[PDB]
Write an enzyme that holds these catalytic residues in place. Structure first.
Site, short mmCIF file in Angstrom:
data_model
loop_
_atom_site.label_atom_id
_atom_site.label_comp_id
_atom_site.label_asym_id
_atom_site.label_seq_id
_atom_site.Cartn_x
_atom_site.Cartn_y
_atom_site.Cartn_z
N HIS A 54 0.92 -1.10 0.00
CA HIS A 54 0.00 0.00 0.00
C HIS A 54 0.97 1.16 0.00
O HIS A 54 2.16 0.90 -0.10
CB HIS A 54 -0.87 -0.05 1.26
CG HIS A 54 -2.06 -0.91 0.96
ND1 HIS A 54 -3.34 -0.37 0.74
CD2 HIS A 54 -2.14 -2.25 0.77
CE1 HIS A 54 -4.15 -1.39 0.47
NE2 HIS A 54 -3.45 -2.53 0.48
N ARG A 92 -6.01 -5.42 18.17
CA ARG A 92 -4.81 -4.68 18.40
C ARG A 92 -3.77 -5.00 17.34
O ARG A 92 -3.71 -6.14 16.88
CB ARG A 92 -4.25 -5.13 19.73
CG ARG A 92 -4.99 -4.56 20.90
CD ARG A 92 -4.15 -4.88 22.11
NE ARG A 92 -4.02 -6.32 22.18
CZ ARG A 92 -4.14 -7.00 23.30
NH1 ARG A 92 -4.36 -6.38 24.46
NH2 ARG A 92 -4.05 -8.34 23.27
C1 LIG Z 1 -11.08 -0.03 -0.31
C2 LIG Z 1 -10.47 -1.00 0.67
N1 LIG Z 1 -10.96 -1.15 1.89
C3 LIG Z 1 -10.41 -2.00 2.78
C4 LIG Z 1 -9.32 -2.81 2.46
C5 LIG Z 1 -8.58 -3.59 3.27
O1 LIG Z 1 -7.48 -3.30 3.98
P1 LIG Z 1 -6.71 -4.59 4.52
O2 LIG Z 1 -6.20 -5.36 3.38
O3 LIG Z 1 -5.44 -4.03 5.32
O4 LIG Z 1 -7.63 -5.53 5.45
C6 LIG Z 1 -8.77 -2.61 1.18
C7 LIG Z 1 -7.53 -3.37 0.74
O5 LIG Z 1 -6.96 -2.75 -0.38
O6 LIG Z 1 -7.84 -4.69 0.39
C8 LIG Z 1 -9.37 -1.72 0.29
O7 LIG Z 1 -8.85 -1.57 -0.95
C1 LIG Z 2 -11.33 -17.54 28.20
C2 LIG Z 2 -10.65 -16.63 27.21
N1 LIG Z 2 -11.17 -16.42 26.01
C3 LIG Z 2 -10.60 -15.60 25.12
C4 LIG Z 2 -9.45 -14.89 25.38
C5 LIG Z 2 -8.69 -14.14 24.54
O1 LIG Z 2 -7.60 -14.50 23.82
P1 LIG Z 2 -6.79 -13.25 23.24
O2 LIG Z 2 -6.30 -12.50 24.41
O3 LIG Z 2 -5.55 -13.91 22.44
O4 LIG Z 2 -7.67 -12.32 22.27
C6 LIG Z 2 -8.85 -15.18 26.63
C7 LIG Z 2 -7.54 -14.54 27.01
O5 LIG Z 2 -6.99 -15.23 28.11
O6 LIG Z 2 -7.71 -13.20 27.35
C8 LIG Z 2 -9.48 -16.01 27.55
O7 LIG Z 2 -8.92 -16.22 28.76
#
Ligand SMILES: Cc1ncc(COP(=O)(O)O)c(C(O)O)c1O
Ligand SMILES: Cc1ncc(COP(=O)(O)O)c(C(O)O)c1O
Ligand SMILES: [Mg+2]
Lengths: 389, 390
Positions: free
Chosen positions: A189, A251
Site C-alpha cells: 500500500h 490490536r
Molecule cells: C477499499 C479498501 N478497503 C479495505 C481494504 C482492506 O485493507 P486490509 O487489506 O489491510 O484488510 C482494502 C484493501 O486494499 O484490500 C481496500 O482496498
Molecule cells: C477464556 C478466554 N477467552 C478468550 C481470550 C482471549 O484470547 P486473546 O487475548 O488472544 O484475544 C482469553 C484470554 O486469556 O484473554 C481467555 O482467557
C-alpha cells in the site's frame, strides 16, 4: 508467465529492519510505546486530531462502523440507510451487513471510478443516514460536491481511505473529510507494516470509544477522564477488570507500529515518485486509441493505473490480459469490479440498488489495472505503452 | 524494573524463537503463508484434530467460531437462538454472541472446579437450547462425560473456548477437541506465545472451509479447488481471485507468528510437564490451608495459574490479602474477570437471561484471587507464597 512488471514491491530499507530489531531488543511485543508514537505522528501527518492503529484496514472499517452504535446518543441504528459505491473492496461492505444496516448501492462515475455525483444527488433522501465514500486507487472524491448534496443536514460522511493514503483535495488530506477515515498499511500500500490499518477522527468521544473497542471492551487504554465511563476508579483490582462496550481484540503488533514510524517519514518521497510516474504515464496514454485512463480529482496518490476499454473499440479484455501477461506485465481487475455480481454473499445483505449500476458493469467487463510504485517506472511505462498498441 | 518476587507472567522464548523471526525476515515474505500453514498442520496433529486455522488472536478465534455457524449450507445457528454460557470467563467469550444476535443464557459456576456447574446445567438445558459454549477455566477441563450425558443425544452444539487450557486432557482426550470447534490463544503469557495469536480446531470439513474463507476477506483464494463453500473453483484467475462468497473479516495472523508458533509447539510438552510439577507441589502446600480453597482438578489440568477462594466464615478480607501479597512482591489478579454479570453497562446491549442465580460467581467475585504458574520451576516461590499466606 514470468513477471517483470509486478503490481507490488517493497517499501522497506534498512531503517525498517533496524526498527524491528529495536523491538526485538526491547522484548516487548504487545501493542505499546511505538504504536502510540506511531498514532501521534499519524494524526499529525494527515491533519487529524486523533488516530487509532488497528490490525488491518479491514478491521479499521469494522471499528469505524461499530463505533457509531456506541455513542452516548447513538449515531446509527439497526436498519438505517447507508449509501455506498458499487465498486470497492469486500471489507468496505461486510461491516454494514454485520451491523444490520440497510445498504443503498450507487453507481460509479466511469471517468473518476468514484461514486457518481449525479446519481448520488438523486439517491440521497430523508432516510439517508450516512454516506460511506471510497477514494478509489488514490483518487479522492470531490468532497465539495458531496458537501453540497448533504447541504448541512445531519448525514454522516465516512471515508474508506485504504487505497488513497496521501491523496489531497483542496489542500486537505483524503481520510480527514469524514467523521472518520480509514487507512490500510498492508503489504504494497502507500506504506506497509506487514498488516495494519488506522482510523482517524477529530471527535473525542469517538476516539475514546475506538480505544475501548479495539481491545476487549475494557478501560485500560482510556484516560482517567474519558468520554466512555467518565471517571475511572482508582481500584485497579476493579478498574482493570471492567468491560463497558461490546468490542473485539484487533490490536496491532508493536512491530507494525515501529515499522510505521519509519514508513511515515518516507511518505513524502513515496508520494512524489508515484506522482511523477503518473505524470509520465498520462502523457504516454493521453490519446490512446482504445483505452481510457482515470480522471484525476484534486491530487491523487495514484495507487495504480487503471484502463477502461473504450466503448465500441471492439477490443476484448481477455486478449489484453493475455497480451500483458505474455509480456511479463502483471495485471488485475479494478479492485473487485462490480461488487453487485457477488450474489451469494449479497443474500446476507439487506440492500437496494439506486437506479442501475451500468458503469460498474461496464468496468467489470472492460477494466483492468497495472501497478504504480514508489520507484521510477519510466521504462516500464514506455514498454507498457509499446505492448498496448 | 519491577522488584517482583513472584510474577504473574514470563517469557517462553529462547534463541529458537528469535532465530525463527530472523528466518522470516530473510525470506522477505511477511504475510500469512507457508509458516502459518506448517504451524496449522503441526497444531492439528498435536491436539488430535483434523484441521486447525490460525487467527490473529484467541478473541478473533471466538468470533469466527460463532460466525461459522451461521454460514453452513444448512445454518447451524440463527438470530435469537439460545446459547448457554458460564458466568465466569474472558469478555471476548461473550461479545461474539451479542454481535451475532444470539440469546444468552448465563449459568453459575461450580465453586470448586471453577467451571460451569453441572447440576445447574442439567436444569438449564431446554428444548430451546441450541448450543452450549463451555470454557475450560485456568487450565481445568470440564467434565465432558457429564456434559455429554446432559445433551443426551439432543441436537445441541457443543463449543469450547480453550484459550486458557491448551494442553489439558480429559479421559485421554485433549481439551478443545471435544466440541464441534475449540478455540486457543497464543497471546503473551499463555501456554505458548506468538506475540498475539489464536487458533480454531475442528474435525468438520465444511466448517474448516468456511473458516478459511471468513478469515480472509470472504474470498476463495485459500480454498481448495473442490471445497464445501463454492463446490468447484473456476480456472479463470482474473475471475475466481476476486470473488466474495461469505461475509467475513480480515483476521489473518502474521507469517512471523506462525514461525514462532512452530518452535513453541515443540517445547509445549515440557512446558506442560513443568507446570504440572509446580501444581503438584503447590497443592501439597495448600491442600490443607486454613482459609483458602484451591481449584479442584478435573482430568489433567494444564494449570494456567493458581486460584484461591477465601473460605466462608473465615473472617479474611480479600483486600487485605491482596495488600499482603503486593508488599511481599507477589503479583496477583482477580480470577479472570470475576462475575461477568457485574458488567451492567455492557449487558445492556445483550439479549440475555440468568438461570436461577449466580451465587457462586458472586462469591468468587468478591473472594477470589489468582497467582501465576509458569513453564519454569517455582518451588521457592511457592514456599514463599505459603509463608506470606500464613
Ligand atoms: C477499499 C479498501 N478497503 C479495505 C481494504 C482492506 O485493507 P486490509 O487489506 O489491510 O484488510 C482494502 C484493501 O486494499 O484490500 C481496500 O482496498
Ligand atoms: C477464556 C478466554 N477467552 C478468550 C481470550 C482471549 O484470547 P486473546 O487475548 O488472544 O484475544 C482469553 C484470554 O486469556 O484473554 C481467555 O482467557
Ligand atoms: Mg528455584
Amino acid at each position: 508467465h514470468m513477471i517483470n512488471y509486478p503490481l507490488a514491491s517493497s517499501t522497506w530499507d534498512d531503517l525498517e529492519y533496524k526498527a524491528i530489531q529495536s523491538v526485538l531488543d526491547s522484548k516487548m511485543f504487545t501493542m505499546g510505546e511505538y504504536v502510540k508514537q506511531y498514532e501521534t505522528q499519524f494524526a499529525k501527518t494527515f491533519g487529524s486530531k486523533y488516530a487509532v492503529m488497528v490490525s488491518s484496514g479491514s478491521t479499521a472499517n469494522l471499528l469505524m462502523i461499530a463505533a457509531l452504535f456506541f455513542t452516548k446518543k447513538p449515531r446509527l441504528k439497526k436498519g438505517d440507510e447507508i449509501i455506498v459505491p458499487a465498486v470497492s473492496w469486500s471489507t468496505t461492505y461486510y461491516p454494514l451487513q454485520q451491523y444490520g444496516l440497510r445498504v443503498k448501492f450507487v453507481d460509479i462515475d466511469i471517468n473518476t471510478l468514484n461514486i457518481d455525483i449525479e446519481s448520488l444527488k438523486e439517491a440521497v433522501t430523508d432516510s439517508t443516514k450516512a454516506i460511506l465514500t471510497v477514494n478509489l486507487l488514490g483518487n479522492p472524491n470531490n468532497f465539495d460536491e458531496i458537501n453540497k448534496i448533504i447541504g448541512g443536514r445531519d448525514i454522516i460522511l465516512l471515508e474508506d481511505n485504504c487505497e488513497s493514503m496521501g491523496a489531497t483535495f483542496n489542500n486537505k488530506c483524503a481520510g480527514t473529510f469524514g467523521l472518520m477515515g480509514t487507512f490500510s498499511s498492508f503489504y504494497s500500500h502507500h506504506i506497509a507494516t506487514m498488516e495494519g490499518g488506522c482510523i482517524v477522527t477529530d471527535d473525542e468521544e469517538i476516539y475514546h470509544i475506538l480505544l475501548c473497542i479495539r481491545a476487549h471492551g475494557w478501560t485500560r487504554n482510556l484516560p482517567k477522564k474519558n468520554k466512555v465511563t467518565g471517571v475511572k476508579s482508582d481500584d485497579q483490582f476493579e478498574e482493570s477488570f471492567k468491560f463497558v462496550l461490546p468490542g473485539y481484540n484487533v490490536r496491532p503488533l508493536e512491530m507494525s507500529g515501529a515499522i510505521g514510524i519509519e514508513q511515515l517519514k518516507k511518505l513524502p518521497r513515496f508520494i512524489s515518485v508515484r506522482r511523477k510516474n503518473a505524470e509520465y504515464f498520462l502523457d504516454k496514454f493521453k490519446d490512446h486509441p482504445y483505452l481510457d485512463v482515470q480522471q484525476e480529482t484534486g491530487e491523487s496518490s495514484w495507487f495504480g493505473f487503471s484502463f477502461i476499454i473504450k466503448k465500441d473499440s471492439g477490443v476484448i479484455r481477455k486478449q489484453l490480459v493475455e497480451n500483458l501477461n505474455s509480456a511479463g506485465i502483471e495485471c488485475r481487475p479494478i479492485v473487485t469490479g462490480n461488487f453487485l455480481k457477488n450474489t451469494d454473499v449479497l443474500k446476507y445483505f439487506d440492500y437496494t440498488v439506486h437506479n442501475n449500476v451500468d458503469n460498474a458493469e461496464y468496468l467489470d467487463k472492460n477494466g483492468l489495472f497495472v501497478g504504480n510504485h514508489q520507484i521510477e517506472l519510466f521504462d516500464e511505462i514506455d514498454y507498457l505503452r509499446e505492448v498496448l498498441k
